[PDB]
Structures are given as structure tokens and as C-alpha cells.
Amino acid sequence: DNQFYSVEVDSTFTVLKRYQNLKPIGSGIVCAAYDAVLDRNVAIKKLSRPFQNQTHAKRAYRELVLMKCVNHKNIISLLNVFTPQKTLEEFQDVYLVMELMDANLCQVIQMELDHERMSYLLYQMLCGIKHLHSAGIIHRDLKPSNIVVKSDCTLKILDFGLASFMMTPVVTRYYRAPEVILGMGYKENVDIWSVGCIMGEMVRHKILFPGRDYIDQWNKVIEQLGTPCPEFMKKLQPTVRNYVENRPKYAGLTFPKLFPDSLFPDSEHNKLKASQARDLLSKMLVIDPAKRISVDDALQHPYINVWDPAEEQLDEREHTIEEWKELIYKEVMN
Numbered sequence: 001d002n003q004f005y006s007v008e009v010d011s012t013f014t015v016l017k018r019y020q021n022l023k024p025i026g027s028g029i030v031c032a033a034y035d036a037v038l039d040r041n042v043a044i045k046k047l048s049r050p051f052q053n054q055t056h057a058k059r060a061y062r063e064l065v066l067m068k069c070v071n072h073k074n075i076i077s078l079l080n081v082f083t084p085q086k087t088l089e090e091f092q093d094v095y096l097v098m099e100l101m102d103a104n105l106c107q108v109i110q111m112e113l114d115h116e117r118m119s120y121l122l123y124q125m126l127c128g129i130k131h132l133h134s135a136g137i138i139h140r141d142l143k144p145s146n147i148v149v150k151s152d153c154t155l156k157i158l159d160f161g162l163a164s165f166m167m168t169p170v171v172t173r174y175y176r177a178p179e180v181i182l183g184m185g186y187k188e189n190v191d192i193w194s195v196g197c198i199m200g201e202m203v204r205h206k207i208l209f210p211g212r213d214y215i216d217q218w219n220k221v222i223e224q225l226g227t228p229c230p231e232f233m234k235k236l237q238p239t240v241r242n243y244v245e246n247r248p249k250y251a252g253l254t255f256p257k258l259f260p261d262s263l264f265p266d267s268e269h270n271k272l273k274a275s276q277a278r279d280l281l282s283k284m285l286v287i288d289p290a291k292r293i294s295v296d297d298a299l300q301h302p303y304i305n306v307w308d309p310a311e312e313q314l315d316e317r318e319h320t321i322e323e324w325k326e327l328i329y330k331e332v333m334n
């Protein structure tokens with residue numbers, strides 16, 4: 001009779017009966033399942049009471065909305081959105097359904113990958129970001145835990161970035177651009193830094209800029225790339241300027257030392273690709289956005305250009321719990 005059924009997977013998933021054989025894959029928590037109507041495997045993500053606070057509410061709502069503003073194979077697209085609750089007063093949970101993938105990009109980064117695989121992943125990450133930029137969306141918080149891959153090397157970005165306080169048991173900040181670390185103005189190529197942080201981790205198999213807080217993180221950036229030029233300092237607020245100028249200076253190691261040929265593959269082809277990879281890196285991991293490569297110029301770097309012309313409820317302010325609940329509920333039921 002009822003359209004939904006419930007299964008305990010530490011959380012309770014109450015889902016439509018078309019979705020069967022639920023099992024955990026990652027932590028909103030996400031299950032894999034078989035969709036009997038579409039005859040294919042899907043992923044299901046549960047948002048529990050996303051209206052419970054402004055952080056969860058703002059992200060749930062904008063990401064629900066922004067779905068309909070994007071249609072790109074490298075960007076998440078939803079197959080289904082539902083709530084088992086029957087009315088606004090009873091509304092609690094949102095379920096989101098998408099194509100089931102094979103792995104998270106974190107897992108992929110731990111593997112040795114040939115240049116064909118690495119360069120195609122990056123090409124796709126750059127297409128996605130370019131498509132987001134075309135639709136007036138600048139991510140600013142791209143990181144591998146929110147990117148998923150299929151065995152055929154195809155990739156999808158699952159989130160839409162920054163618009164705080166978290167009352168729960170943490171956010172990953174290591175892929176954020178200096179503009180974000182230091183609170184500067186930004187433009188599209190803020191997202192290139194993140195790609196470069198991913199690319200470099202693919203090579204080194206270690207997070208490039210770890211740290212407890214932005215303090216450590218910035219140390220790691222300067223120690224490795226050197227202190228930026230005065231033209232960069234002038235773009236900083238006077239208070240963060242004082243902070244940055246008074247940190248110990250650093251000459252900054254060259255990129256051959258940062259990514260030596262030992263981390264790259266036996267053939268002239270691989271020798272040439274390694275130098276092209278290092279080159280792209282050195283253009284992406286550039287502290288000053290004025291001298292950092294753009295999405296378009298990156299897409300035509302020789303490392304990347306081997307992979308196609310075909311491949312070219314607005315954001316709201318602060319609301320209360322009850323208003324967010326209604327905004328989100330309405331979106332779920334168009």
C-alpha cells in the first residue's frame with residue numbers, strides 16, 4: 001500500500017520501493033541501490049532535517065536549486081528527489097538520487113596513473129569548472145572528496161562550493177586558493193588553484209598544503225612556492241597584509257624540486273608528458289591570481305588539449321528554520 005519502505009543501514013533510509021538492495025558506500029549519508037524502474041544502479045543521499053540550521057539549510061537549498069541551472073556530464077545531475085513525509089508539518093528528510101559511480105577521487109589519487117588517465121581526469125575537472133563558470137557559478141571549494149569517478153575514467157563533481165559554524169563532529173580546507181585563505185577578492189581562476197592542488201597530490205601522493213588551520217596551511221604554501229611579490233600584497237586588506245608581510249620570508253623551491261622526475265614515468269613519450277605536466281603545475285600553483293593560468297588557457301595546455309568544442313529561486317539571504325523548511329520543501333515538490 002505505502003509507496004515507501006524503511007531499512008536500517010547507523011542511519012534509517014526510508015525510500016521508494018523501486019530502490020532495492022541498499023548498502024552504505026560513504027559518509028548526509030549515501031547508499032548504493034538497484035533502481036528497478038530504470039533497471040540500473042543508483043546512489044542515494046539522505047539529508048536529515050537540512051533546515052536544522054543556516055549552514056545545512058543554505059547549502060541544501062542552493063544545491064537543490066543550482067541543479068536545474070547546470071547540465072554537463074562532468075557535473076552532478078539528479079535522477080530523482082523525494083521525501084517520504086507527506087506534508088510540510090511532517091517534513092524531515094530529503095533523498096537525492098544519481099547515477100552510481102565506482103570510486104571517490106580520493107581513492108583514485110592514491111593509485112599510480114599513466115598520463116592518459118591523469119590528463120583526462122584533469123581535462124574533465126576543467127570542463128566542469130568551465131561549465132560552472134559559464135552559468136555564473138564560482139566554486140571556491142573544489143576538493144577530491146566531492147568528485148567521483150567511474151572505471152572508464154569519467155568524472156563528476158558533486159557540489160557547488162561556497163555561498164558559518166558547525167555544531168557537529170570537519171571541513172577540508174587544503175584545496176582552497178590563497179584568495180579564500182586570506183579573504184581577498186576572487187575571480188574564475190580561484191578554482192584553478194584547487195585543480196593544481198589535486199594534480200600535485202596525484203603526483204606526490206601527499207596533500208600539498210596541510211595544516212590545522214589557515215595559519216599552518218599558509219606556512220606550507222609559502223615555504224614551498226616562496227613569498228609572493230609586493231604587487232600581490234597590495235591586493236590584501238591592511239590587517240591581513242601586516243600578517244602576511246611579517247611572516248618569515250621564503251625563496252620558494254623550483255618545480256623540478258617540488259615534483260622531481262622520479263614521481264613521473266621509460267619512453268620519450270612519457271618524458272615529454274612529464275615536462276608538460278610539471279609545466280601545467282607551475283602555471284596552476286601560482287599564489288598571485290594575476291599570474292595564475294586561466295581555465296581557458298589551461299584547457300589548451302598541451303598536457304590537456306589532447307582531449308572537443310562540444311565538451312561549450314536565485315541565491316537567497318538569511319532565513320529562519322521555518323522559512324528554510326518551507327523553501328526546501330517547495331523545491332522538493334515543484
Ligand SMILES: O=C(Nc1cnn(-c2csc(C(=O)NC3COC3)c2)c1)Nc1ccccc1Cl
Pocket residue numbers: 025026030032043044045076096097098099100101102103104148158159
Ligand atoms: O557521494 C555521492 N554520490 C556518489 C555516486 N557514486 N558514489 C560512489 C563513491 S564510491 C562508490 C562505489 O564504491 N561503488 C561500487 C559499488 O558497486 C561499484 C560509489 C558516490 N553523493 C550524492 C548521491 C546522490 C545524489 C547527490 C549526491 Cl551529492
